[PDB]
């Protein structure tokens, strides 16, 4: 992302929606739901807060933090070796190698019995109130406004209170701005393009940045002169 | 003057009162005049109300340390009030003159103490107790009950009694408990 994620409170979207006389019955209760829906449907990683938190494994199982939504990586606390997805179907079940993990709910199923693991996970930036906190990027705000507008007009059109042309125009505008926001939050910055360039041009390829925490994904690959 | 034991028996029978004059050597000539029991429904800002719940003159007894320490064990059924949905004000009136040279503000002829039955409040708090265990959620009921009790405590010990009745009526006037079984029980 070229731009920065300056955070603002949720009713900044209701500043903008309620200009429209047909969206005057929207509330913070509706804003919260549709904003979470938009955050998830877009799936932009720059909107989440990067956090690292260590837990202990009792026996191939560990308690997971409360605010976790996705896991960037899991590693062993003492070695630093990263973990992979567990393809095994019989992990903690005995009969009569390289470590791995799996996460479903509040439980993480590792292949280690008793060890501490570091989890780099993503969460949502919250407000002083326990509510989501949205970027103030006007592209993001306009796209979220159009999302909420499109949902409300879909309801009104199912009722027959909106002309079909109106809903078609709203959907068209929302689709274009959804593409625009997706590209805005995804296209690399200049500093990120240096990382991508250092990853791309490698006379001797580096294919083991997963073992580390992708620390050296972006380091330059310096060849000595002979 | 001070309170030694101010409590309602957990069996919901007895409003226990145990007052004693302070032991310093300026408080010989000060004695106990009377004990006035008052409730939230008949409270007045200054002094006891003109329609109290119970009056007890100390001097209608042996006539000196027997005066200086007094204890009452009123049965609440006789008072015709609920031990749990009732908040009592105990006024103790002194009879005498403290000797001079006492630091001022120690020569307070009247002392007041508030009484409530915490057992039903603990019954209500135990419901939200286990929210303390669960993580990822705020124990909102536990915090609410703690703040409800602490409001009454704070408003009592600051002397802001009227707001204390307002909070008591809002929160705990609908408290329920097992009335004392008038036929006494065999145990020991």
């Amino acid at each position: 992302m070229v731009n920065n994620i300056n955070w603002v409170k949720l009713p900044v979207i209701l500043d903008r929606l309620l200009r429209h006389p047909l969206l005057t019955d929207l509330n913070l209760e509706t804003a919260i739901q549709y904003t979470l829906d938009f955050i998830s449907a877009m799936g932009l990683p720059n909107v989440y807060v990067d956090k690292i938190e260590t837990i202990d494994i009792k026996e191939y199982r560990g308690e997971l933090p409360c605010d976790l939504i996705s896991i960037n990586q899991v590693r062993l606390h003492k070695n630093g070796i990263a973990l992979r997805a567990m393809t095994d179907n019989f992990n903690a079940y005995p009969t009569h190698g390289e470590p791995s993990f799996k996460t479903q709910g509040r439980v993480i199923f590792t292949s280690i019995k008793h060890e501490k693991v570091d989890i780099s996970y993503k969460a949502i930036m919250l407000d002083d109130e326990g509510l989501p906190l949205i970027p103030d990027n006007p592209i993001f705000l306009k796209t979220l406004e159009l999302y909420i507008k499109k949902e409300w007009f879909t309801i009104l059109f199912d009722m027959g209170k909106i002309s079909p042309a109106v809903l078609n125009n709203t959907q068209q505008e929302y689709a274009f701005k959804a593409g625009q926001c997706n590209n805005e939050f995804v296209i690399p910055s200049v500093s990120e393009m240096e990382a991508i360039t250092n990853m791309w041009n490698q006379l001797i390829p580096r294919v083991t940045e997963f073992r580390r925490g992708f620390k050296n994904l972006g380091d330059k690959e310096y060849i000595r002169v002979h | 003057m001070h309170f030694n034991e101010l409590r309602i028996s957990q069996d919901n029978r007895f409003l226990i009162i145990d007052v004693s004059v302070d032991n310093q050597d300026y408080f010989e000539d000060v004695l106990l005049d009377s004990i006035v029991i008052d409730t939230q429904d008949t409270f007045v800002m200054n002094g006891p109300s003109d329609n109290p719940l119970y009056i007890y003159n100390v001097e209608d007894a042996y006539d000196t340390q027997q005066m200086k320490n007094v204890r009452l064990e009123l049965n609440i059924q006789d008072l015709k009030v609920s031990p749990c949905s009732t908040m009592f004000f105990v006024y103790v009136k002194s009879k005498g003159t403290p000797s001079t040279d006492t630091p001022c503000g120690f020569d307070k002829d009247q002392i007041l103490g508030t009484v409530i039955n915490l057992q039903p409040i603990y019954k209500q708090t135990l419901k939200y107790l286990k929210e303390v265990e669960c993580d990822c959620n705020i124990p909102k009921g536990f915090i609410d009950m703690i703040l409800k009790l602490k409001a009454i405590e704070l408003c009592v010990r600051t002397g802001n009694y009227p707001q204390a009745i307002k909070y008591w009526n809002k929160f705990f006037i609908k408290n329920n408990c097992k009335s004392p079984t008038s036929n006494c029980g065999c145990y020991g």
Binding site: - | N4, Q10, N23, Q119, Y122, K123, L126, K127, L129, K130
Partner: protein, 107 residues
């Protein structure tokens, strides 16, 4: 005990009160009711003579997992007058302003 009987009576009375108002209680909660009255039966019969104090400890600590689990089973209230921070009502009575060889001195 005489208190497991009261807790069980209250629990099943609440259970059938819910089945009177509603027509459904969680069977995950009926399981706790079943555990509770099974323990009540076992401890109040000819099977209590096999109980040691370690067994009593384990039984009580297992039963207290049922305490606030449901609305039917509730935390019991016992007669107690203690706390984690007790009061200091001791009084100081100095004698003839007399310090001892190192410490102060009272009656």
């Amino acid at each position: 005990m005489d208190k497991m009987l009261e807790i069980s009576e209250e629990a099943i009375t609440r259970y059938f009160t819910t089945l009177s108002q509603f027509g459904y209680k969680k069977y995950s909660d009926v399981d706790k009711i079943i555990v509770l009255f099974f323990m009540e039966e076992m401890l109040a019969g000819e099977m209590s003579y096999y109980v040691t104090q370690d067994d009593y400890r384990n039984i009580v600590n297992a039963l207290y997992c049922l305490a606030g689990s449901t609305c039917m089973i509730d935390f019991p209230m016992f007669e107690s007058y203690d706390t984690l921070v007790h009061s200091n009502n001791r009084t100081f009575v100095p004698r003839i302003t007399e310090d001892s060889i190192l410490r102060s001195t009272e009656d």
